[PDB]
């Protein structure tokens, strides 16, 4: 809350580090855009049947 | 009989603060006097509001 807020420099670098990652996981292909939203994912379309 | 009351005016709000001061002048009384502390901020900003 101390005003004016001063951010640490490292933070931006950590952000870039996190956003640049591309890995394989339980959610499928994991990659992010500049805003942090998911990209290149796969959403399986499923139907409930008798079997 | 000084009454401390905080206030928050979004930057770019003028007539509101004007009518606020006019209200302070007209409704002023000998019994007690309100003592506002004005701080202008970005109303959409949650951090600013919290601070
Ligand atoms: C990966 O996802 C992004 C975001 O939708 C898309 O623009 C891009 O074409 C995708 N790449 C491939 C190879 O599907």
Swiss-Prot record, chain B:
Palmitoylated. Depalmitoylated upon L-glutamate stimulation. Detected in forebrain. Detected in dendrites of neuronal cells. Expressed in the pyramidal cell layers of CA1 and CA3 and in the granule cell layer of the dentate gyrus. It is found in: Cell membrane; Postsynaptic cell membrane; Postsynaptic density membrane. Induction: Down-regulated in the pyramidal cell layer of CA1 in the hippocampus by global ischemia. Ionotropic glutamate receptor that functions as a ligand-gated cation channel, gated by L-glutamate and glutamatergic agonists such as alpha-amino-3-hydroxy-5-methyl-4-isoxazolepropionic acid (AMPA), quisqualic acid, and kainic acid. L-glutamate acts as an excitatory neurotransmitter at many synapses in the central nervous system and plays an important role in fast excitatory synaptic transmission. Homotetramer or heterotetramer of pore-forming glutamate receptor subunits. Tetramers may be formed by the dimerization of dimers. May interact with MPP4. Forms a ternary complex with GRIP1 and CSPG4. Interacts with ATAD1 in an ATP-dependent manner. ATAD1-catalyzed ATP hydrolysis disrupts binding to ATAD1 and to GRIP1 and leads to AMPAR complex disassembly. Interacts with GRIP2. Interacts with GRIP1. Interacts with NSF via its C-terminus. Interacts with CACNG2, PICK1 and GRIP2. Interacts with GRIA1 and SYNDIG1. Part of a complex containing GRIA2, NSF and NAPA and/or NAPB. Belongs to the glutamate-gated ion channel (TC 1.A.10.1) family. GRIA2 subfamily. The M4 transmembrane segment mediates tetramerization and is required for cell surface expression. The postsynaptic actions of L-glutamate are mediated by a variety of receptors that are named according to their selective agonists. This receptor binds AMPA (quisqualate) > L-glutamate > kainate. This is Glutamate receptor 2. It comes from Rattus norvegicus. The lineage of its organism: Eukaryota, Metazoa, Chordata, Craniata, Vertebrata. The chain holds residues 25 to 75 of 883 of the full protein.
């Amino acid at each position: 809350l101390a005003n004016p807020a001063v951010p640490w420099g490292q933070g931006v670098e950590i952000e870039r580090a996190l956003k640049q990652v591309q890995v394989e996981g339980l959610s499928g292909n994991i990659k992010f855009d500049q805003n942090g939203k998911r990209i290149n994912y796969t959403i399986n379309i499923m139907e409930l049947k008798t079997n | 009989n000084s009454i401390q009351i905080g206030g928050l005016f979004p930057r770019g709000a003028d007539q509101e603060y004007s009518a606020f001061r006019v209200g302070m002048v007209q409704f002023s009384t000998s019994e007690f006097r309100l003592t506002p502390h004005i701080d202008n901020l970005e109303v959409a900003n949650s951090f600013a509001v919290t601070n």
